[PDB]
């Protein structure tokens, strides 16, 4: 419901930021498993479905402070900051070059060749919002317990493995939102930009791209970017690269950090 | 139809869902799959059981009441839901090391078959099967007897999406000789194994005007949506496999059309 | 060498027919394997090589007869139908959803899983033309004793393996013209416009894509589409999904039909 | 050369093939094939026998005779591998899907896909590399002679021009960035040996030879330079023996005159 | 720098740089990394020199030229020597090996190829994908890096200031600067992958950023840096080994006049 006026273009109406997400693929920061999972197990049927904290991924979230434009928000008009493009990189591919790090080898039997590296399901997405992404709940297995640490609907019921209605959220917090239990909602999120792949699989290589000269085109269709309510740009995704393997063929999520620059201009609206 | 001026009040927006119907009944444990798939020894004895196979959504969206006027739709968006749900590798997965009881879950893997349709009457099918002699159960809407030609083109095998969750994917498709009113999209992988490949956003405007300007138009008001999204297979652990779907949103933008 | 005059516009100016073509995978019409070749046998070597009839596909071709649209054919100039666009699908993509039908199980030796459903090699293209589709013949092995019900140039050679200028043909009959056998001449076909992929492999995942929504430009560099001779308009293709692969390890080529729109115009020409 | 005026019968159009050059002699039963492939053991010992390993197809092609002189002007081409079609054969000799069940189809051509093709007014320049610098090439074939471990990786000294057919190995040349001024090439590579070969062919693709400075490939000698190679993968025997296998090349070339200081 | 106008004024380069995949130069194993070994876990991760590819870099001197400087406006760059992978017959594993059968399975596994160009080193972001890895004398990383280096760690930076001693697998292009250098990268993973190259003379990059302004080359120096791993090469016995290739660059740079 913000009534969107005109564009301002001085050598002053454009604004910059950059920020990283780092990854929260589940083992905590400044350990020495920070960008992985806990080592995954599995249930042996729908109803003792409980994965433990640590063994599954959840989105990475952050607020970024912009800076305030109105000395008095009781004006007939405000400014507030437009996002009109970004660039965003996948960052520290790189390291998906090391295949001799404590890796299941190739030729397991023989105890030969390098290890396998990084391998399997690959999910990637990012959004840029003027609030926080909205969220639809919805789950592979509904009778999954969830832990304590993790966001989630409890009791979901049978109507959560496809769409209902009700069970609706919004991406409040970092690293407590499970990746397998919450999507973008394309009944909402008028004033956010989403962008999304998966590609599944155990053994599927790992495809990522980085480059600086990129950049993606915010404004929508009435050429409007999102607008930062109360001057707070939202950041939000999730980096699943794929899953490392030991020897004992434990096997955990390993994630990268999002690089994000995001680039805003002052747009007038109706207050 | 003798479309004459578009007018411009003039313009209305509908958003809908459609639920997978890939077998397994509503508000119980399995929505979203199928039951687990057994497999006929031969053509002649073929007979999937109800509930192993998965059937198109469809539904009818009643738009704003209203020479004539007519709700022309000019563009939409959708979408699959829950892509995110399938990062699960954890809930009664075949293992990747089943052997040493280790790994993750397989996850969901093999065939992607993606449709969708938006019009202003049901979506108009041809009959196809790969084997004619299949015994469809009696909640399948089919053509009965379908003769060998059903599994090729056979121009009297014809039949409209008019019921939600009993159409077979695997006997109905879009007949590309009919559908002047309504605009279809496909995509298919096949396998057992095959990585799934889905992609989401918020920013795809498919614009639905042919090659005359014109729109899908809403006879009696109704804007018609169907679909099917089968992501792939679930394996148990004791190897049993079922379909897994997911449900698609649908963004129609509609404006009023002067019709003779 | 047909001279070509002024387009004719106006409401009587275009025409559009609708065709299809059925698949000749080696199966008899009307019988229980119809859209199936038979299962495939494989030579010892390539001297004994004699692929028995049924076992193979065949292009699949039509002459669609236009509205004859000349009252007088000795006049100095004549209107004949030329093709400025297209739609073409391939139909029946909805079956390979089916994994119950008599197929070997993803897991065999525990008699569990779904059918592994048709995988393999696509083959698929298709030409819309004035006159028939000119063809190349080329084989895999020139030594090959094709079955007397096929169209091909008997004891063609060993320069058949490659190309030899010598070994022309035209499609000019439906479901005999070997697809293994023969294919499109880029030397010729200046009244056809052809297209073709061919994904190999026989555990190669089908990938197929259908819409009304997709046309296909026919008009050349010069702004004339293929020109339809004796108001003929020639339709050809191949659509070789994969294979179905039975309990018992047979194994047998699986075919699509596919549909045409074409979208012609009168065009004046020289007489 | 100084390039003038386009003087655009100011325009031609040529029509050739190439046939592959996968080891096996033209006009015998394994034409478009290697031989079978033998494996070395190590580097100090490797020496891939005649007819186990492809070669770039060339051709000069004798074009329309002709203070400045015309030059012919390539300005446009259609290139398209012929033959895909035989690609749908799973009968002929071919390893079975389910070879201990002696069941299912041949499993087809599968593997690597080397796709190259150059268009020039003179002949390919090229740069020498190979994967093992020990390799020792048959007599048949062109090669650099004692090339050095620097052959592995780029030497500036390893130059050479492709000048006959069918003699250049694929695995020991490949096209000169530093050079080819006056030729335009476009390759793809895709490896392995069970990979899928992915082809597509139809007559509806024109690619524009011209240059940023709007200057086609200038045809010396009044001759047009045509390259290629074409491995669509390997065949398999039922005793697993393997043999690359090409298909043939198609080039449409359209050429204008062109004024240039003499 | 205050960029004024475009400025005799155009020179072109071409340079090519050899990869660095862990074996001596001039040596037989030249192009290739030693036979990758794998450590049991995480806290005993000791990879030996030769076994791991490093970045390759060179400063191009430019021509002896308010004052002008070089700035880079397009390039052209190629992987050479893609024509060496047709190579199935030199020591690989068969793919009947226990038929002793078959061509060898040729270069397979990951790919990793990133070049850059621009008017100053490339600037770095350390990251490691086990932070408690001991990196050789011989290579340059950033000692005890702690587990905050397994992902973004803003303390964590360095610059290419010398070729074949940066670990590809320990530092990557910095997002947060390389204002003056444009970057560009693709990997694909696993083991058994098939490499998938292209080559041509055809393709010019516009190197000019939003505002027009290519990179500008400080001390009259072009800075080039990639690296380009093809793939494994596996030999009978097993053992695995880097392989990588070579990479051209060509840039087109004009005079422009700054502040
Ligand atoms: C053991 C197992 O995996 N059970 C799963 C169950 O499979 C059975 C079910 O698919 C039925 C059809 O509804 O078919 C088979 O059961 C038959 C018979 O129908 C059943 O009554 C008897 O118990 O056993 C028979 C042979 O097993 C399948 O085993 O399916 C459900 C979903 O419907 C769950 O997947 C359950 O884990
Ligand atoms: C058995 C078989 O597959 N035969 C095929 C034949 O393979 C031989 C061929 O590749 C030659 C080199 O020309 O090498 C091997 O044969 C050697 C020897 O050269 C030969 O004279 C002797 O008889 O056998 C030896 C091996 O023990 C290969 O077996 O090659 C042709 C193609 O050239 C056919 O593919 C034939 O089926
Ligand atoms: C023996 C081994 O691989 N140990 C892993 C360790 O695995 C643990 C698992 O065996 C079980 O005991 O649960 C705990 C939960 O924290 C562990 O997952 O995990 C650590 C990293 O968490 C490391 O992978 C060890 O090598
Ligand atoms: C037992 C079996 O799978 N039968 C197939 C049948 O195979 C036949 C083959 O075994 C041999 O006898 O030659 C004939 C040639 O016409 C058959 O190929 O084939 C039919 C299809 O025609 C069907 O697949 C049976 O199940
Ligand atoms: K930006
Ligand atoms: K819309
Ligand atoms: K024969
Ligand atoms: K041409
Ligand atoms: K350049
Ligand atoms: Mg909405
Ligand atoms: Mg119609
Ligand atoms: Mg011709
Ligand atoms: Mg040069
Ligand atoms: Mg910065």
């Given at each position: 419901g913000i009534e969107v006026l005109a564009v301002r273009t001085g050598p002053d109406s454009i604004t910059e930021i950059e920020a990283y997400l780092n990854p929260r693929m589940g083992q905590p920061q400044?350990?020495?498993?920070?960008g992985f999972s806990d080592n995954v197990t599995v249930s042996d049927d729908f109803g003792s479905d409980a994965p433990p904290w640590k063994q599954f991924p959840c989105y990475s979230t952050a607020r970024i402070s912009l800076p305030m434009l109105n000395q008095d928000m009781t004006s007939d008009t405000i400014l507030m900051w437009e996002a009109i493009s970004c660039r965003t990189e996948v960052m520290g591919?790189?390291?998906?070059?090391?295949?001799?790090?404590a890796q299941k080898r190739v030729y397991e039997n023989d105890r030969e060749g390098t290890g396998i590296g990084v391998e399997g399901m690959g999910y990637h997405m990012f959004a840029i919002g003027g609030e926080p992404l909205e969220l639809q709940f919805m789950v592979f297995n509904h009778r999954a317990t969830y832990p304590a640490e993790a966001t989630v609907i409890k009791?979901?019921?049978?109507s959560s493995q496809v769409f209902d209605p009700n069970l609706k959220g919004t991406?409040?917090?970092?690293?407590?939102?499970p990746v397998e239990a919450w999507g973008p909602d394309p009944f909402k999120n008028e004033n956010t930009r989403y962008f999304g792949q998966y590609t599944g699989g155990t053994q599927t290589p790992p495809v990522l791209t980085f480059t600086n000269t990129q950049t993606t085109i915010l404004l929508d269709e009435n050429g409007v970017g999102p607008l930062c309510k109360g001057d707070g740009l939202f950041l939000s995704c999730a980096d699943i690269v794929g899953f490392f393997t030991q020897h004992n063929k434990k096997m955990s999520f390993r994630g990268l950090p999002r690089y994000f620059r995001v680039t805003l201009r002052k747009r007038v609206v109706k207050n």
């Amino acid at each position: 419901g913000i009534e969107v006026l005109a564009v301002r273009t001085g050598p002053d109406s454009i604004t910059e930021i950059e920020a990283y997400l780092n990854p929260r693929m589940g083992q905590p920061q400044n350990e020495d498993f920070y960008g992985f999972s806990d080592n995954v197990t599995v249930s042996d049927d729908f109803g003792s479905d409980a994965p433990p904290w640590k063994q599954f991924p959840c989105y990475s979230t952050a607020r970024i402070s912009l800076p305030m434009l109105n000395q008095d928000m009781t004006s007939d008009t405000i400014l507030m900051w437009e996002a009109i493009s970004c660039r965003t990189e996948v960052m520290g591919v790189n390291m998906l070059t090391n295949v001799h790090s404590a890796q299941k080898r190739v030729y397991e039997n023989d105890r030969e060749g390098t290890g396998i590296g990084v391998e399997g399901m690959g999910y990637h997405m990012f959004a840029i919002g003027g609030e926080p992404l909205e969220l639809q709940f919805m789950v592979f297995n509904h009778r999954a317990t969830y832990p304590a640490e993790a966001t989630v609907i409890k009791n979901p019921g049978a109507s959560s493995q496809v769409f209902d209605p009700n069970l609706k959220g919004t991406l409040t917090a970092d690293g407590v939102f499970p990746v397998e239990a919450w999507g973008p909602d394309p009944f909402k999120n008028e004033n956010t930009r989403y962008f999304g792949q998966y590609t599944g699989g155990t053994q599927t290589p790992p495809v990522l791209t980085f480059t600086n000269t990129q950049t993606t085109i915010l404004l929508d269709e009435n050429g409007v970017g999102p607008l930062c309510k109360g001057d707070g740009l939202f950041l939000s995704c999730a980096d699943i690269v794929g899953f490392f393997t030991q020897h004992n063929k434990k096997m955990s999520f390993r994630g990268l950090p999002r690089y994000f620059r995001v680039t805003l201009r002052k747009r007038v609206v109706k207050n």
